[PDB]
Every structure is written in C-alpha cells, then in structure tokens.
Amino acid sequence: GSLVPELNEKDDDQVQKALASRTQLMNRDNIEITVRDFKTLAPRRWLNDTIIEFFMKYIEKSTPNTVAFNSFFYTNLSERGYQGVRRWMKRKKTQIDKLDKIFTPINLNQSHWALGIIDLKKKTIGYVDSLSNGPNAMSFAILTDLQKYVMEESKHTIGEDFDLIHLDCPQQPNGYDCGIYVCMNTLYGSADAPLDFDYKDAIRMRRFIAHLILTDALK
C-alpha cells in the first residue's frame, strides 16, 4: 500500500510501444492526448499542460469532494481576476462550500511548475514547490489570488481567515521534473498523506500517468 504503483510487465511494455511511435492515444473529458503529448512523460522531458490536465481530471474523478483545475485556471485568475474564472466552479457541477479541497497547478513563467492547495476543511491555502527558493513575491501573490478566489466564489462566506502557508515538500534532484512533482504532491494531498515521497517514487509516477492514459482511466 504505497500511492504510486509499480507497473506489471505487460502494462509497462504498452507504455514503451506508445513512447516509440515517437497517433492519438486518448479523447475523453475533452482532453486529447497524442504520442506527442504522451512523450513529455518520457524520461527527462518537461511535462506539458495537457498531461497536467489529464492528471488533474483523474484526481477529480478519483477523490471525493475535490476539484482539481487545469493550469489555465490560475493564469485566467491572475490576469483577469475572479471575473475571468467566475463560471469555472459551476462547470464542475458542485459548490465551493461542498468541497474538501481544490487543487490548482501553477505554471510560473512558462517553465516552473508549482502547486496550490486550498483545503476548505483545514481552512488553509498552501503553496507547494519542489524547486523552492523559500517564500517569494510570486508565492505570496499565488496565495493572495487563491484566497481572493475562495472569498469571491463563496459570495464572501469563507476564506478570509484561512492560513496562507508555504508547505514543505520533497525537493527535486534535477531541473526538469517539476511537473511530475506537482502530480506527486496532488495525489498525496488528495489522500491526506504527508509529502514524504522520494525521487524513486516520482520516476514511477511517469510510468503511472502513461498507464492511466493508455487504459482510458477517466472512465
């Protein structure tokens, strides 16, 4: 009972084959994944938005009272404020007051992948970064924006007294696995597990997402 499973020989081979066609692999929940996107899961590649979006949607479907927005959520919120994201929640067929958590993947400066976690139960908003400098101006803004989102989306019933925290997490050994670590932090958060994974667990994530894609995991 760990969270990211080890693939069996048939499933791992299905991944190798799809990675070698270096073709559409999936079109569900309005996410088309090609071999092109699938290959960003290949060893040492930058995970693209589409893979992030797949994984968010998988977390949503596999976690009660949980929303996990795609990377474009935070970009619209940042650039346009609450008004630019005002229908996003309703499109999820739920109300913010009925949630345990909201996950927001954050693409800082086209490259750096980080995570926001709004815990409605714990009444915290966390910034989780695997290539973390400590608190900075960007992390403060994220936290501030995510707080404004809670306050707005809830018609000002909740969020104003949330703890704005910088949540420690496992630090990546390299400068390209941000994406996978966001995914690792999301899965672990969604299970209320401590962020105590290591780099070997992160490499298995790559194979896992690839498996979920190939086995049409979004039902």
Curated annotation (Swiss-Prot):
This is Ubiquitin-like-specific protease 1. GO terms for biological process: G2/M transition of mitotic cell cycle; protein desumoylation; proteolysis. Present with 377 molecules/cell in log phase SD medium. Protease that catalyzes two essential functions in the SUMO pathway: processing of full-length SMT3 to its mature form and deconjugation of SMT3 from targeted proteins. Has an essential role in the G2/M phase of the cell cycle. Belongs to the peptidase C48 family. Keywords: Acetylation, Hydrolase, Phosphoprotein, Protease, Thiol protease, Ubl conjugation pathway. One of its GO terms (molecular function) is cysteine-type peptidase activity. The chain holds residues 403 to 621 of 621 of the full protein. GO terms for cellular component: nuclear envelope; nucleolus; nucleus. It comes from Saccharomyces cerevisiae (strain ATCC 204508 / S288c). It comes from the Eukaryota. Coiled coil: none annotated. The active site is at residues 112, 129, 178. Residues 30-219 are annotated as: Protease.
